[PDB]
Each structure stands twice: as C-alpha cells, then as structure tokens.
Amino acid sequence: VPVPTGGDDPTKVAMLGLTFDDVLLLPAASDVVPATADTSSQLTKRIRLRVPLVSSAMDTVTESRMAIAMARAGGMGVLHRNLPVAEQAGQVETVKRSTEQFPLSTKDSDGRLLVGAAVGVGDDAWTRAMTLVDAGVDVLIVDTAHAHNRGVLDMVSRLKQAVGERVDVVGGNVATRAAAAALVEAGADAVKVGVGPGSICTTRVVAGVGAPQITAILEAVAACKPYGVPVIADGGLQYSGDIAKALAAGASTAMLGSLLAGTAESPGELIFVNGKQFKSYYFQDDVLSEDKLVVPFRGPLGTVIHQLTGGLRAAMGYTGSATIEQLQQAQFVQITAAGLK
Amino acid sequence: VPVPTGGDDPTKVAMLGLTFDDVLLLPAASDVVPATADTSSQLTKRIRLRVPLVSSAMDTVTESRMAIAMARAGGMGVLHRNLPVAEQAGQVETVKRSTEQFPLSTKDSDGRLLVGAAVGVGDDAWTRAMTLVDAGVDVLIVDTAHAHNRGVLDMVSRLKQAVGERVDVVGGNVATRAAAAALVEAGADAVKVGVGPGSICTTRVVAGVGAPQITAILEAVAACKPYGVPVIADGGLQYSGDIAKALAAGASTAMLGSLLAGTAESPGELIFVNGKQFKSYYFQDDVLSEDKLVVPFRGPLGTVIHQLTGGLRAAMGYTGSATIEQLQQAQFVQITAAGLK
Amino acid sequence: VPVPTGGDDPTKVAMLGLTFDDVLLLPAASDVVPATADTSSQLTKRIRLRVPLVSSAMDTVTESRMAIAMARAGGMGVLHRNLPVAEQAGQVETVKRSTEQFPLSTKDSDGRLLVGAAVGVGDDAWTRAMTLVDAGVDVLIVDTAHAHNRGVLDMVSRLKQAVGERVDVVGGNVATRAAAAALVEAGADAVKVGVGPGSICTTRVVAGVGAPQITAILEAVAACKPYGVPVIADGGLQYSGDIAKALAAGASTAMLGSLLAGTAESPGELIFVNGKQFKSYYFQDDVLSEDKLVVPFRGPLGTVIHQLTGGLRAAMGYTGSATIEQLQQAQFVQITAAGLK
Amino acid sequence: VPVPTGGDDPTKVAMLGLTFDDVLLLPAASDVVPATADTSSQLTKRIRLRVPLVSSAMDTVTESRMAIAMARAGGMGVLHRNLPVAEQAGQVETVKRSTEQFPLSTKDSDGRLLVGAAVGVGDDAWTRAMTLVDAGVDVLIVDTAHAHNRGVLDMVSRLKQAVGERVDVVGGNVATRAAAAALVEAGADAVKVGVGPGSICTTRVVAGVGAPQITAILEAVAACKPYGVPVIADGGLQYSGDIAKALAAGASTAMLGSLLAGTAESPGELIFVNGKQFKSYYFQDDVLSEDKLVVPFRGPLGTVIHQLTGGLRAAMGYTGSATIEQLQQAQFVQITAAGLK
Amino acid sequence: VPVPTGGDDPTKVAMLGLTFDDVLLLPAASDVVPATADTSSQLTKRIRLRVPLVSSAMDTVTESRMAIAMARAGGMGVLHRNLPVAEQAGQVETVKRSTEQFPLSTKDSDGRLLVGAAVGVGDDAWTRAMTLVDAGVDVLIVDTAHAHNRGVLDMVSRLKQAVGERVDVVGGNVATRAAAAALVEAGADAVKVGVGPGSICTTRVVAGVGAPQITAILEAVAACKPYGVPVIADGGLQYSGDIAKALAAGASTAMLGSLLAGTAESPGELIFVNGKQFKSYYFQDDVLSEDKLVVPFRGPLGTVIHQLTGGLRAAMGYTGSATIEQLQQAQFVQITAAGLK
C-alpha cells in the first residue's frame, strides 16, 4: 500500500523527468550523408522553414537587424515586446521592407521576409496585436510565462477568430500534456514548450516550479501530434546536440535564445572593456515572468547557424534520418550519472 | 498508459546504458594465481593473440615502429590510413621486413610479424585495399565512424569474397545489436564496437549521438557470439580495470588508442617545452568522423603494456578465470552514484 | 685609481642607461592648447609626416592594407621583407595605386600614397631593392638587427649612390653614437635606433646584449643632429607617454610595432577561439635577428592612432611645445625606484 | 663633455626626483609630548587653520555636507566646480548659513564657517567667480591641471585686482620653482603644488608628464618662502606619515582627496553590494584634466581626521617640533629600494 | 669627513657590487658572423678548450658519464670528491679509458680525454690527490668554500711542488683581489671565482657573506691578468647571456653547475613521479660550505651545450669579437631598476 517514495497517493510524484543530459541518440541504419540531409521543418501549420531555428523574442536577442539576419539564414526572428507599440510596429516594417547571397531566405508570396512578434495579455495587448497585424506581421506569439491560464486561452481564441486568415497564432509556454491540449483546443497553430527548463533557472530556485525539457516535449507532442500542431522546443538548449535531441523528441522547431544573445546582429553597442569585447545597453506586465521574481561578444550569426546546422546534419546522418519528420522517430538511450563526468 | 519518462511509446527510450564506471567485477570461486593466467584471446576467427591489446589505427598512435613494438609485445598494431597509399604499403612492408627477447611475438606461417591496415569506403578505398593486400598485409579494417551504412557492408562483402583466403576483414564501429548482426551477415571476421563511447566525446556534445560502452558490448555480443565472431572493444578505456570489464562483458580484444598516443613508439619527435617533454609533428575523408565536427610524453610502451597485463591478470585471479573465454562469463555488480565520488 | 664597481679600468662600465620608465617630462611655461599643436615631423631629410608614427615592417604588422591605413592616418607604413621579391613589389604597387575622409594623407607630388619597404644585405637584397625601386617605392629600409657591420654600411652607400635622388635610404638599428655617425657618413637619410630595448627582450636573455632606449636615442641624436639626419626610435614603446618621451629625447619619429600587431588592418583572418578573438595565418636570412636566438585582437587602427596622438598632444600642451622641434628641447626628471611601485 | 646618462647636455635630465617613499623623517632633540603639539598652520597669508587639511574639490569628494564637516573638524573644504554656477553658489550659501562639540571650528569675522570654491579659466569662469564672491565665499581656487599657462596667471591677476580685499586667491597646480615664482609674481596668496604625483597617475602613463612630490614641494617652497606665500601639497598622500613628510618639506597645508573620498560626508548614497558597502552617484573645460585622457565606504570623517592628526602629532613629537613652523625645518634621510620590500 | 652612508670611516663600505642583472653588453663595430666565431679559450695556462664550459664537480652534476659527455662536447668535466678515494680514482680511470661523431673532444698528448678531479684540505686530501695523479687525472681542484685561508695556500703550494709538471693545480673560490693575488703567488694555474654568488644563496642569508659576481670577476681579473693566470667564473649563471657577460668581464671559462644538474648524463636514475620526469638519488669536511650552514629532467646535454654556444656566438657577433680574448675587452652598460620589470 505505501508508496516507495512516501505517502499513500501514488500520483503525488507524477513522473520521472528527463533533461537533455539524460539521453543520447542511438545510431540506426543510415543511407544519408550530412551534406544532403533536408533540415526543413514546419514552424506552424502553414509555414515551413529551411532551418528549424527561431530567435527567442528577448530584448537582448531579437530586434529588426537580428530578425532580418535570422530570416535570411533560413529560420525566423520573433521581435520582442519590451517596447512601445509604435516602436515594435516600426521594427516589423523595417524587417518587412527588404539573391545568390541568401538563397535560403524564408519569404511569403509577395517575396518579403517573414517575421513574428510577441504580444502579451490584455486590452493593450489586443491593440498592440492589431497594430502589428496591420503593420504586416506574419506570426503572433502570445508570450506568457504560464499559458495554462484562462486569460491566455481566451486571447489566443480571440486572435485566431479575428485575424486568423491573415496571421498565425502560437500559444505560450506550457510543459504538460493537458496544457498543450488546452492550447490546441483554443485554436493555436503552434505550441511553445518549456517552463523553467534550465538546471538552475530562477523559476526553479525562487518558485520551486519547473519541468525537465525532454519529458515536457514528449508530453506536449503526445497531445499536439494527432492534430497536426507543431511543437516548438524553447529554453534549456546549450549545444547542437541538444537541438538534435529536442527535434528527435518530437519538436518541430527550436527557439535558440542564449546562443544568439551575444552575436553581432543582436541588439546593443559594441565596446571594449579590459581588452575584451562586450555589448552594452514598464511593458513587462507578466506577473509570473522570471524578472518579476528576482553581454560578451560571440561573433557573426552566420558561423553560429552554420555550426548548429552542421551538428544537426551529423545527428541526422548518424540516425539515418533524411528529413526532420524521420528524425522525430529516432530512439533514445538513457545514461546514468557516470556518463556525465 | 503513460510512460514514467513521458510520452506514450514505451520504446522511445530504448534502454538504460551502462558505462565502465557503473559496473564492477564480482569476486568468485578462484583457484588461479595471476602469474599462470592464460591471457590468450581471439582477434579474428583465424587469428589468436597472446596479449589481447591492439593499437587503434590513429595517426598519432600507430606507424611501422608502433606496429612492430605491439606485435613483439604479444598483440598487434593496425596502421592508420591518413597517408598516401604508397606510404601505407611501404609501412606494411617495413613491418613485414623484420627470440629470447620477444618470445610472445605474433607471427604468420612464415614467421613474419603480423600487421593490420585500415581502409575506407569507395573505389579509392578498393585500390588502397588491393595495394595493401599485395604488400602482404594480414588484417584489413574497414574503419568507419558509423558502420551500419549499406556501402560499408557492400565494401566488407566485396573484400571478404575477393581476398577471403588471403586476409581477414573486420567491420567498422557499431553500437547496437542490429548493426553487429548486419556486419556478421556481411561476412566480417570480427566486429569493432563503439560510437562516442567517451563521457565528453565530441560526438555526444555536437551531434548528440552516443552509446555507453558496456551496454553496446553486451548488445553486439548478443549478436556475434552465436556465430563465433570475435568482438573488439574500441574507445572509452582509461585503466586496466576498464580493459578487464570490457573483456568480461563479452569482448575478445581491447583496442587501446589514447593509452599509447604519448608513448615513445608512437609517431612524433620528442622535444622539451617549459621543462616537460612533448611530441611534435586529403585522406581523412570520413563524412561522420569526429574531425569533421570539431601530445605529451608517456614513456616506453613496455611498461604500459606490462601494467595493463598485470591488471588483467589480477582481475582474472579475482574472478577465478583461467582463460579469457572464462573471464567472459564473469558477473557484474552495479554501483550507484555515491560509489563514484 | 680603483673603480668603485671593480677593476682598474674606469671605462669598463661605459655609462648608466635610462629607459622609458626612468624619466618623466617636466612641465614648463606653456601657451599651447593640445588641440592646436602641430605634430608634424621629419621622417627623413626630405619627407615630412603629419603624424610621427611609422609601422615596424614586421610580418605580422604591415602589409598593403596596413600600409594604406597608415598612410591615410597621417603616417607611413613599411612593408615587411619576409616575402618573395615579386610579392613585395606587388604589395608596393598595390599601395601606390590608389578627400574629407583622409585630409591627413601622406602623398607625393603625384597624389599617390607613400610606402616603404625593408631590404636585407647581399646580391639577393640588391636585386630586391632594385625591383622595389622599379615598382615606385619611396623609402628603402635596410632592416638589420645590427647596423654597425661593414656590409650594412656598404649596402647603404651603394643604394644612396644608385637611387639616391629617387628614393630615401634608411640605416638599420643602432644603439651608440659611433654607429650613428658611421651610418650618417655612409649616406643614410635617416637613422633607426634600438637594439634589445625591451626589459625582457630575447637579445638580453640569450645574447646578453642590449641598450636602454632613452640613452640610445640621446647618444644617436648627439651624432645625427649636427647633420640634420632624423632619428627613428624603434622598439620599447608601450604607451603614448613612451612616444612623448622618445620624441622629447631627440627622435623625430617613433616606430610602433607591437602596438599594431593585433589591430584590424594587420594581416591575418579574424577568428574565434575559446570565446576570444585571435588572428590566423627562407627569407629570414638575418644572422643576428631575434628569431635565430629563440596574435590576439586589438580593434581598429583609427582608435589606436587617436589615443596615441591625444597622448602626444597632451604632452605637448604640458611642456609648452607648439611643434615637435620644440618638444625635442624639453627636459627630463629622473625618478627613483619608489616611483614605479 | 659626455654626460653619464647620454648626450652632451648635462641639463637634459634636470634633476633627480624624490617621492614620499624615498625619504623618512630623522629623529632629533625633542621635549614635546604629542598631546601638546600645535598643529595650526597658515592656509593663506590671511587665513590660519587649526588642522592643516583641505578637501580636494572633486565631484566625488567635496560638497556642502563635506565642506561643513571639514570646517567643523578644524580644516576647510573646497567646493568642486562640476556644477552650474547657481548650484555652487547655493552650496556656498548653505555652508555659510550655519560649542563644546566642535572647539576647533574655523570661522570668519562674522562667526560663520569658512568655505572655498574652485573656478576654471575663461569668461564663464569669471562670471562664476563673481557669483560665488557674491555668495559669500572666502577662498577662490583657480583649479587647473597646469598653472604655468599665461591665461591662468592673467585670471589670477584679474581676480586679485577685483576681489583682493575680500577673498583670497590660490594659484593652480605647479611642479617647478619657475611656475611658483610666476604665480607669486601674478599676486597669488597661496600656491598649490603637484602635477601627476601618483605612481600610476594617468598623466604619467598617457602624457609622460609628471614630477615627484617631495622634490616639487621643495622647489616650490624655495620660491614661495622668501615672499611669505604658503604652499599646499595636493595628491600622492596615502597615510599620515605622507602628510607629515609633505609638511616637513616646507608645505603649510595638505590636500587629502582620496583619503576623504570614502567617508560618509562625501557625496553618494551608501548601499550594500556583494557583502561590502559602496557609494552610488559641459563645465569640464580644463584642457589638460585627467578625464580628457582616460566608491567604497570608510566611515565618519571625524575618526579619519583624528587618525591623521594623531600621526602628525606623533611625527612632531619624534622630530621635536613644537609648531608646524618648526616641523618645516626637519631633516630627511633617503632610503634605498631595499627598505621598501 | 662624515660618510654619506654613516660613520667616519670611508672604507667601511668597500665598493658597490654589480651582479649579472645589472649590466648589459654594448653593441660595437662588428665584422664577425656567429657561425665563424672562435669560442676557444684557456682553461689553465697549459690547457685550451674549444668550448669554455666546465661542470661544477658536484655530486649531482659530474660523474664519469657526465665527464665523458662534457669532454666530447669540447669542454671538460671535473669529478666530485664526495666519494671514497678508490671510487673517485676508478671513475677517473673510466673517463681516461676511452671520430667524426665528436670532432671537438678535448684530448691530451696521447689522444685520451681530459678529466678533472676536486680535492679538499688535509692529509686525506693529500693521499686522495696522490691517488688521482697516479690514476692519470689532468687537473686538480682545491675545492674550498673560502680559499684565502693559509691551509688552502699551503695545499696548493705542496701540489704545485710535487706534481707541477704532470698536472695543473687550480685554487678554490675567491671573491677579492687580495685572495686572487695570494693564490697566484701560491702557484695556481687558474683561479676559481665566487663566494655566495646566488641572489638568495644560503651563504648570504645564514652567514651574511657574499660578493656580486661581476665585481668579483673584475677584481680577480685585475690581479690574475698581468701574470697570465686564467679566471674561472663559478656560480650565478642562469642563461647564456650570463655566460657571455662573465666572459666579457675578464673570465676565461665558466663553470656551469645547476644548468647541467638535470640533464641525461648527470647522476641519478630517471623515473616518473605524478606523470612528471625526475631523477633519483663523512667526506664533506668543508666547515664553511653551504652544507654545514643549512631533480627535474632537462634532456640531453648536447642541446644544452648547443644553445649556450649559440648564445655565446650571438654575443660575440654583436660585440664584434672574433675570439674570446677580444670578447674580454667588451664594455658594459649599467641598467637601473626599471630594466628588470
């Protein structure tokens, strides 16, 4: 009768959570060379990217220059919302208002670059979303720290019903199967996954709330896959191997973030301190955001994207996956604590 | 229905992988003293060694001098292939052109020292293999980073059918049971095991692909033992205890590699920098090699081989194994994380 | 009769040597503001630079790009001679074949940029010098580690007699009054000063030969001033104050070297290693060069030249010198050991 | 004829310079107990302080609070001029608009506290000086980096002629006898001494200009003493022994600066960062100021002044000087570099 | 009359001593290429070496193997006396009982190698000296810590009287002109110079006795040069520059010691400790030796001697010295404290 970990309720400890360091990709029968692997993936139900990488809509990562650089590399940039509405709309216009140099560009029918923007929850969020839609945006991200709230679902449904034909809607951060199912029922075209995914993230330390990323992705995919809704792996990524693992768990796209924070195309001013290069620099109304609880130079973005895509191509070659849809069926091997030393 | 680690498919996480640090050899009834232990082992179905150790065909490890020294010590050296075909054939001939000093020498019917050579995949690989066979090479290694490819199996089958009576063919690196079975069916005389076997290997960090070595050896043995095909452990070894564990898990020979890189017989000139000695110095076309993703001094080879043999003999004495074929029937005990600190 | 430092020879220890850290510039009666001081100086008896800074003709410092940048900044670059003769002549032509962006450009009668080139000693050196002169070069530097040799003086005399009217000949490194007088008599248009001027230079540690830079400049100037020959202070500089002291000691132009090794315009590709920027890359026939005895990033060159010129202008304002020819009449104060701690 | 340090001019290195670390005070015949020593000394020819310490007129050191505290403790504060004229005049008024707690207070004829204000050079400097005179200031400091400029002397003469009968005029920073003589000829009532007195002062590193403080004070006193003009030592002081040495070289008052920066009476709000206490915070027209080239907490001001006065009293007792006028005749002993380790 | 450094006797502080770090060799007129520099020098009045280097007769430096290696390299080794007399005589015979490989070997009339041996003071020293002479030794060293004693002079006179024709006698360590003159009068064929020449030598710390090496050499040469007696510099050498400086001050041969302690030919067995290379190891009657007051690996001796000779040749080329006799006329420049940072 007693549970081995204590108590009488077997469901008090729901499940054992796996992170990126707990699993490795098993080699399989392969007829694919890395140079010919097709790394194209679905961002939403209507948009296909050439490189499954998306910027993280942070104020230190994505602006108009970063969005253009990401869109020309085959991915997409999502503009942050720590700005006045007019500033974000102007950044959207700057991205939109722009070929052997960048054949891999992601473009709509009109030939303009694709860009997304983040909107919060509320009436100001509604007017900001409408202004961004009229400015020519393509994807609307409902950037929330916890997307299982009723207000977030109401906003997602309202956006999908009002401007559903013009633009796509992406749900906020979730980490369970039930939350992903709720977002799918609300009408979202894509689901962003991750709630305190880092090992020592501030959400885990201060609030004591978190979810290991591999298990969270597998749970969200278990709810999103039958309906054709893509899953975006957000947070916790540290290497190209982590990106390959996230894509192999069922996610269709990876939101990079800290990898692109210190690149040249990121916002900030380049200065020299102690012989080392650095980048120097009200609307964050989210109650559960991390900043409500509590940069070094990395070079050009092209080399970073090249390294990440090379690692992903190597993983595809090892696992015998010619497409991302075939990489999503790859198997894992769980490693013990001795495998991390 | 829910899996304890997330998702619905119980085969998404195939198995838990054990490394060399997760297991220890259990003592058993013993009547064997370390000095009379029989350390002879099979390298292939037609070749038997006196010390089950082989150099790992790396450009910093094995050349003609290293091959001669390793064959005179009771094992065998495998010449690397980062060289023009003429140079590799010349080194093969130099090894062939050579008793109280070296009683344990491994020799063919003519009394000449045994040597192996690594080849690649393709038509250039075919002409290199034919040139090496003409020069009197004894073992051909189809050395690939991921040997479960179809072209690798075709190359192995062609070599086995053409020069089956002349030389023995050994398949590339594998990590699963299916790959080992495929290599056995292809006609290989021995199977080399290991894909990213190190804890911080570059294959794991960049590509996210790997396999713990103990589990990989147990899986490849489960496919190779019914046909009598020897299994060669490759990579992940750090001590003589790791060699004993690999031989007890089912492998018939351990491939040393980094344990011999800094020794005197390895290629490189001995120089002095900052008061310590160091060693100073087109054909690396493997698509999945670790080089595509990304040496100090160690003293004489004789002391290293003597220490490894002493450790193996101590393990044989502890486990009551008179021969390696009995050491392969030993039992493991699995230790927790606290046993590593 | 006995000398306090030992022996009976009062001239055994010739003199005490002062370095850049031993002296400071004394403030004097001033009516000069830093921003209106004239930093023009004579590089040779016929060439006048706008900023008295010249690159040091090292293989990691000055090539065509660096020479163009230096000539546009107001000084002059000297091309290194670690190249085949044809390549050096091609770089000379590249610099020669080229205004509110660069008002301070150093240009000849034809409006083309000035460039210098280094030559050695010998028949190969003679043919290299003739090839460079045929390419339109302006200043020929006899780059030798010790210019008091007879061969260097003979080469200088030959060049002055052959192409004296077209180009200017500059003698090699000297550190005494006698060598400076010998170079002046041989026919040099400018005398370069410094032999192991650094504190831990390889010449001092290995060969035991050296000369502090302030004393060396004062001695060479005592020989070169009566004949109007400018003195080029080469080596030992680490700050703009060092440049100010060198110009106040009597030198007319400073040769920079290590301060420009890792700048943008120096040769080499800008690469990233370990999260930090670095630069990636038969003719070293000098018998007495430092090479026979035994780079990181710095930023754009414009900021370096701005900082150095600002330091020199501040020094000119402090000492009350409206011209470099007036700065050469400044006085020093010698500081003790406690002034360095 | 040749000079031992190089050249033929014996006055190129004018003199050897001594800092505070190069000298120590020699004990002499004494009959003065520390508790009865008189520490009163002239600040100007008309104002006599009871404690010979003055704050250094910097934006991080002296404001109205600091000036009031210094005047209460027995010295005087000089208000910095990095302010609009109205703000500085208001601070002067605040200090003026203000007894067994502060027996040593320095007061004017009307019984108000004494305060000084620093002015620059120019017409704006003239209007600022006149506005501060109308505010009730007592001492006008012509704060410059190099006071041998003609404009500084002209400004001093103008101020002396205009407001001579009301307030006192103090000349800027000097480091030579000639500059002090020029200031005295201009009509200054006190001469401030020091041009880059620190070992690692930015003026020495960037401009190469400086003068050791002991020699500078001895030279300026050699000119100011025959005319009865006091000498103020500014910069380079780090202990009470340094204050004693400065006063013994002939100076009548020491300007502290960094020794008063970390006190609570200095501007800046006190907070706690990383377990340690710290302080938080157009008119900079001085062409040679340090800011044109390129804080911790220490407690109450009274304890710092007590410690410094105790050290000075101990020095007076050791040297047998009943008054400061007797301490200024004390002798020094010069120590070698071996006494600093 | 009062001395600047205290007292009334001007001869209390005899002289200012210079070490190797206080002087540098001034460049002079040169016509010597380092490849043709003649490094031949006198060891005694009847022995001329081809390389002026001698081992220091310490138990950790020189034995039979080291002596043979040094004699074949162009110099000479001196066997240490920390052994039984029979063992030392046997080692002398071993060296004696022995050519394109070693063209520069130092040889006697019969063509055998030259060796040296050290003796103490006393009757045991006399019997040891007689045994060594009967064993064919060529040079006898009266190895004492202080050679101005009457016993040392008596021993030298006795040896020169008894075996003057067959072998040469060398006096112990001296550091003054008077001691050198006394040894020369006693009849020594060479004078060894240095009494606590190290910077932190145990003699300087425990006994407080020592003399800087450059001054000591200049003083001993002042007494030895008129009579044609060579001077040997002992101790204090750390680099080839120090060797060049010692030979320039007037010494004819340098005794290496610590530079040859960790080589291959020095006594001590080669082993590995913590992954690092190391060496493993009643007659000490010297009362004033450092022993009464109180190794790592270096590689083959050939490279060490080659580097030292290369540095010496570089110094000879810089100073224009065709021979060592001409190098002894070179001049020094004295550097201040700032020349060592």
Numbering used by the authors:
A (entry chain E), B (entry chain F), C (entry chain A), D (entry chain D), E (entry chain B): 12 to 109, 223 to 405, 428 to 440, 448 to 494
Give verbatim excerpts from the published study on this entry.
Central to the purine metabolic pathway is inosine-5′-monophosphate dehydrogenase (IMPDH; EC 1.1.1.205), a rate-limiting enzyme catalyzing the NAD+-dependent oxidation of inosine-5′-monophosphate (IMP) to xanthosine 5′-monophosphate (XMP).
The dataset of MsmIMPDH in the presence of ATP and IMP was highly heterogeneous, resulting in multiple 3D classes of MsmIMPDH octameric assemblies differing in their compression and extension range.
